[PDB]
Amino acid sequence: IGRDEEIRRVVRILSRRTKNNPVLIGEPGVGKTAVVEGLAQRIVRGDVPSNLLDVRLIALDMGALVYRGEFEERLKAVLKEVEEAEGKVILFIDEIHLVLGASMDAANLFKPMLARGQLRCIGATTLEEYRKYVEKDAAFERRFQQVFVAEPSVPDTISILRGLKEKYEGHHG
Amino acid sequence: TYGRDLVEQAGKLDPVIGRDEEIRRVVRILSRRTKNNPVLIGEPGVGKTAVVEGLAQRIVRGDVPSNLLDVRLIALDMGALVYRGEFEERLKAVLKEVEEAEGKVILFIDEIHLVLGASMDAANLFKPMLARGQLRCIGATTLEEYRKYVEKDAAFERRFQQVFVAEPSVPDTISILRGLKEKYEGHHGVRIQDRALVVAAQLSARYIMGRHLPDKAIDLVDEACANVRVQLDSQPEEIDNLERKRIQLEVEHPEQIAEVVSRWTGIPVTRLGQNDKERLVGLADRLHQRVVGQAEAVSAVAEAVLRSRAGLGRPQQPTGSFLFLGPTGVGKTELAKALAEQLFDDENLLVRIDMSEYMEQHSVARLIGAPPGYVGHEEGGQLTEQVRRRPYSVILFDEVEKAHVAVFNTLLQVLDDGRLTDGQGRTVDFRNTVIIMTSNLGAEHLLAGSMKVARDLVMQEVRRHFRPELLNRLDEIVIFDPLSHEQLRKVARLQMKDVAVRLAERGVALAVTDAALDVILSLSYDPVYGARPIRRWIEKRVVTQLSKMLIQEEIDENCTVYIDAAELAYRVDN
Amino acid sequence: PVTRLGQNDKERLVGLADRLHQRVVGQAEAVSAVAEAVLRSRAGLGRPQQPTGSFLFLGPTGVGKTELAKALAEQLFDDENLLVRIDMSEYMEQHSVARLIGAPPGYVGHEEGGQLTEQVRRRPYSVILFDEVEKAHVAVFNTLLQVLDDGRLTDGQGRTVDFRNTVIIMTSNLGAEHLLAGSMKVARDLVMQEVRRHFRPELLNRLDEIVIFDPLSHEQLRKVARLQMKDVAVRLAERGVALAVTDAALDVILSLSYDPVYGARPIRRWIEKRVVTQLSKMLIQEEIDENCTVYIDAAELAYRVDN
Ligand SMILES: Nc1ncnc2c1ncn2[C@@H]1O[C@H](COP(=O)(O)OP(=O)(O)O)[C@@H](O)[C@H]1O
Ligand SMILES: Nc1ncnc2c1ncn2[C@@H]1O[C@H](COP(=O)(O)OP(=O)(O)O)[C@@H](O)[C@H]1O
Numbered sequence A: 001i002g003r004d005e006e007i008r009r010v011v012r013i014l015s016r017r018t019k020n021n022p023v024l025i026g027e028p029g030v031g032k033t034a035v036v037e038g039l040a041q042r043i044v045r046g047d048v049p050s051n052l053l054d055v056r057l058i059a060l061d062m063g064a065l066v067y068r069g070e071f072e073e074r075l076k077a078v079l080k081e082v083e084e085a086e087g088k089v090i091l092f093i094d095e096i097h098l099v100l101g102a103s104m105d106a107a108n109l110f111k112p113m114l115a116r117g118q119l120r121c122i123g124a125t126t127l128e129e130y131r132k133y134v135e136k137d138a139a140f141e142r143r144f145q146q147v148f149v150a151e152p153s154v155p156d157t158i159s160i161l162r163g164l165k166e167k168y169e170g171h172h173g
Numbered sequence B: 001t002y003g004r005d006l007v008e009q010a011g012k013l014d015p016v017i018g019r020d021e022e023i024r025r026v027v028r029i030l031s032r033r034t035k036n037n038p039v040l041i042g043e044p045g046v047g048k049t050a051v052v053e054g055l056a057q058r059i060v061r062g063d064v065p066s067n068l069l070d071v072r073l074i075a076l077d078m079g080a081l082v083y084r085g086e087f088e089e090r091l092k093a094v095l096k097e098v099e100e101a102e103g104k105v106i107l108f109i110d111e112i113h114l115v116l117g118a119s120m121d122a123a124n125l126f127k128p129m130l131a132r133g134q135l136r137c138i139g140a141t142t143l144e145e146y147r148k149y150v151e152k153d154a155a156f157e158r159r160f161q162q163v164f165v166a167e168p169s170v171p172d173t174i175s176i177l178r179g180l181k182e183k184y185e186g187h188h189g190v191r192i193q194d195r196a197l198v199v200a201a202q203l204s205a206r207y208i209m210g211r212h213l214p215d216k217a218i219d220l221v222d223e224a225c226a227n228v229r230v231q232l233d234s235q236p237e238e239i240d241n242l243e244r245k246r247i248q249l250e251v252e253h254p255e256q257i258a259e260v261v262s263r264w265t266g267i268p269v270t271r272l273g274q275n276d277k278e279r280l281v282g283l284a285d286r287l288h289q290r291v292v293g294q295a296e297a298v299s300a301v302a303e304a305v306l307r308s309r310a311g312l313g314r315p316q317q318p319t320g321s322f323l324f325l326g327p328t329g330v331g332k333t334e335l336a337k338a339l340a341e342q343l344f345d346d347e348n349l350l351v352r353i354d355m356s357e358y359m360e361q362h363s364v365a366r367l368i369g370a371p372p373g374y375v376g377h378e379e380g381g382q383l384t385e386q387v388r389r390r391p392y393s394v395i396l397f398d399e400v401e402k403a404h405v406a407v408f409n410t411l412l413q414v415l416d417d418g419r420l421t422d423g424q425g426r427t428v429d430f431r432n433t434v435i436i437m438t439s440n441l442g443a444e445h446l447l448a449g450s451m452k453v454a455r456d457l458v459m460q461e462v463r464r465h466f467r468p469e470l471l472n473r474l475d476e477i478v479i480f481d482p483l484s485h486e487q488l489r490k491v492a493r494l495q496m497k498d499v500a501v502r503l504a505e506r507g508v509a510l511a512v513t514d515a516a517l518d519v520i521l522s523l524s525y526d527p528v529y530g531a532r533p534i535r536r537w538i539e540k541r542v543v544t545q546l547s548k549m550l551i552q553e554e555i556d557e558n559c560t561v562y563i564d565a566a567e568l569a570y571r572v573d574n
Numbered sequence C: 001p002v003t004r005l006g007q008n009d010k011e012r013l014v015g016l017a018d019r020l021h022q023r024v025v026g027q028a029e030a031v032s033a034v035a036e037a038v039l040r041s042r043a044g045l046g047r048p049q050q051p052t053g054s055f056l057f058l059g060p061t062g063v064g065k066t067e068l069a070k071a072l073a074e075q076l077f078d079d080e081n082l083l084v085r086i087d088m089s090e091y092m093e094q095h096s097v098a099r100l101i102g103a104p105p106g107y108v109g110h111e112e113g114g115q116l117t118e119q120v121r122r123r124p125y126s127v128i129l130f131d132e133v134e135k136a137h138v139a140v141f142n143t144l145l146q147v148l149d150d151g152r153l154t155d156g157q158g159r160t161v162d163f164r165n166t167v168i169i170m171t172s173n174l175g176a177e178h179l180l181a182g183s184m185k186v187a188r189d190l191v192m193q194e195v196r197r198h199f200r201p202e203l204l205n206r207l208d209e210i211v212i213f214d215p216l217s218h219e220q221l222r223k224v225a226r227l228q229m230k231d232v233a234v235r236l237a238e239r240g241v242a243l244a245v246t247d248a249a250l251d252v253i254l255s256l257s258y259d260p261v262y263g264a265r266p267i268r269r270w271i272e273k274r275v276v277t278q279l280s281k282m283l284i285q286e287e288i289d290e291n292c293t294v295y296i297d298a299a300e301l302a303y304r305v306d307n
């Protein structure tokens, strides 16, 4: 609860025709996965505008998905087979910088279809990784737009504690 | 086959207009007997692919001279065409299988430098037949690639000629927007206006800094075009916000395009209302609380902010610069803190810059963006990343005079006409930040005192110390007037209100009389030091006395203390 | 543009002086010198071993030394900021020659791009402007003698760059006190003898012409006041409000806030900080409608609102 702004921003940017791949930026410990799960709950409930009522959210797990050639052809088959939806599926990736900007060489392989705009991707990382990895190349800057998340409101935290009190009360009794 | 054909795609690529010059240049250079391989050069974001598609449309329609009426345009896709040796032999097969035309085909390559000048070794392989002149090739890349890739060898310079593309024409961009309006109107199906279009075109080139030449206004208009559909055609969001706040309560128990640019980087240039009316009216009165008896500086800063917000003012200035001169401990930074708190809800967003450790001129490399020459690791300067992504901040200096001449003589260019270039060559805009400086010179001459002769002495000293040039640029220089007994009493009351509220947080009320203020100011006043001793004395006496009396459990709830002259007498009552 | 001239070039070259005589007021000598230099270069005559004119500007501060250069740059071509600004405020030590000119590729050869190498390349018709020339090191300044002699220049890589069409223009602040003290002939002689004694008696022969700016008088003050009024007038009229003034208003404006030493900046500062803030404050309270003209007259100042 209490994250009404980032969901609205993501809804606004996703419906845009071109350059519609938002990337969450911010320091750790503020709730990036929390707002992602909030968006998932919103689409499950159906409060989102009906323009995205025929989309299923799928996440990628590095540990679950893991010779380098075997890993490469497995991933290539994965992004070849996800194409059966053709624009009605959203792919979520955590720790984009480690698996893309890096070590293993995959940036050149991931560039073509991403530039073509095969699907819509969502990322999440800290701003230091943005300053250190993505600013040294002119290719990835074509897409992706910054979205800033911060929680400096002391009065808001009380609402979060009130919301989360019930689970702990039930567990401890 | 494995490439890409563009003849049939021209039926449904977007129309391109307003590029009548580069097509003519390419047509003229393609009919030359020898050295007829044009290469497009220019910064990204201007439309190199756009003019290529325009040429393709021209040849499809047939307006091209008949000398090139028997030619098809084939493009090459790196990803489509991709062991290294297998790749080499496949490309070799492509280049010998394309020879069946023998001069009646043009090969287009994008990002020629990455795949040719480079890693994989193909330059020596591509040199011989290219020098022979088997066909005609077209490239496209930026100018830095030309600077650092092709100038290091004497082979590729035999062919290829530079073609320069740029879009600095503001009036032309309006034509581009009018041309591209139809596709977005058809896709969204919502009524639009023209004044909004021209306003967006005018605004896109001044406030939002970055990207490149103003062909980026399409994204700005598309943002609002997408927002309006969800706002109106789809479910409204105001009711959703209202019901969300109701749920939270239950749990605990042409104007449109102005909004997007406002929320993009700040700078609330949105249309003003009655709330802004009385806020701007009462800005001076609200700012006249933390500081006392400083009418000149308060009026200056208030009128500067109001003038900047109204809509007038030269667009080649940082919207005000000031120099503060006066005694120590009079409230120089208190006015800056109060102004920062009043302008926006933040308390410490202002950036504090001091040069107490900038005595040696070798500190320029860390004050400003250092060159990437040696290691390029500490490129983050002192005034580089703070102003970026936040151009509405307030920058505050401190003891400016104590700096070296060289370090201080690099902030003249920004005070002249704004903008600044760092080692990396990026231009950062100081077009909305209020620059404020301060210094302690001329304190002795002022505290010695007539007032007029002291002011003249201070002014002549500051004129003689600094060069007679920089003192012209500063918008206004003001001197703080030492305060009197009434200001002393008011500041004493203001200081005591803080401990009053801090104690009242625990549930104890405070009340005092005029005689208490009189004795407090009489016992511990020094004209030289200003106002610090008052706070030090009142704290070190009253707080310790109250805490010592409270520890012994002499205070209950709903108890009010009273202070009066005898020194001081403490009375405890309900 | 060495192409053949027509009647449009005819009257353009005829009226170049008159058109340039707008931004700069009461400086006939420098304006005439620049106009004749440009006309002579365009006509077709002139020695082919010169940069087509070099000038030195000497005078008080805040008189309009760079305003003439800006107006000339705007008039010559439609660009407004194509001129290259070169300053040596950070060139006190002679070790900055390697960055002023094309550095040798000896050590790493990475910063080979000099200060005066890539700008003039692919653009040999530009205008190069110096600033506070006297505040440089002697060794640093003693490297441009060769170009002023016969053109051309060699950098670290050995490439020859040609300064065969660029109008080199410099300026300096020396001799200000002697001029502002004042007869005028003795002040001019003092300034000339000081500048001769400071510099070597060799370089002063190469410069085509040295001129001194004459301090302006009351009529020039009134004209520049009107010129400064016009800017805010058009800026406000962009919103749809007309402006009008009287002679007495200009008289009081120039009388209240004039200082002979500083030149013309205080006039602009005062007029802005008073008139603009007064008009903005009165406009905020919604006292202005469309098709409304403001009038200013002496009493100080009185503001009258009318259709
Ligand atoms: N609005 C919220 N309500 C409840 N819990 C939250 C909220 N926002 C954040 N959190 C908590 O913060 C944590 C977010 O951690 P996360 O940012 O994913 O760590 P990292 O940045 O290392 O991945 C979650 O475990 C979640 O419990
Ligand atoms: N004359 C024009 N009319 C309409 N759109 C244009 C025009 N010129 C450029 N554009 C837009 O600018 C973009 C050019 O991008 P491009 O230069 O290909 O990027 P990059 O340089 O990174 O390859 C195109 O997407 C096109 O929509």
Ligand SMILES: Nc1ncnc2c1ncn2[C@@H]1O[C@H](COP(=O)(O)OP(=O)(O)O)[C@@H](O)[C@H]1O
Residues within 6 Å of the ligand: B290, B291, B292, B293, B328, B329, B330, B331, B332, B333, B334, B491, B531, B532, B535
């Ligand atoms: N209206 C006021 N007039 C004078 N002094 C004030 C006023 N309000 C606060 N002060 C005091 O002035 C102090 C500010 O000190 P300051 O002048 O910033 O020191 P320095 O000049 O060494 O930085 C604050 O500690 C505050 O207690």
Ligand SMILES: Nc1ncnc2c1ncn2[C@@H]1O[C@H](COP(=O)(O)OP(=O)(O)O)[C@@H](O)[C@H]1O
Residues within 6 Å of the ligand: B469, C023, C024, C025, C026, C061, C062, C063, C064, C065, C066, C067, C224, C264, C265, C268
């Ligand atoms: N015709 C004129 N005569 C005198 N001053 C003028 C004229 N036109 C403009 N000015 C003023 O002269 C100023 C130029 O200052 P300048 O002499 O360049 O300072 P500096 O010599 O320190 O570079 C401009 O700000 C402008 O307001």
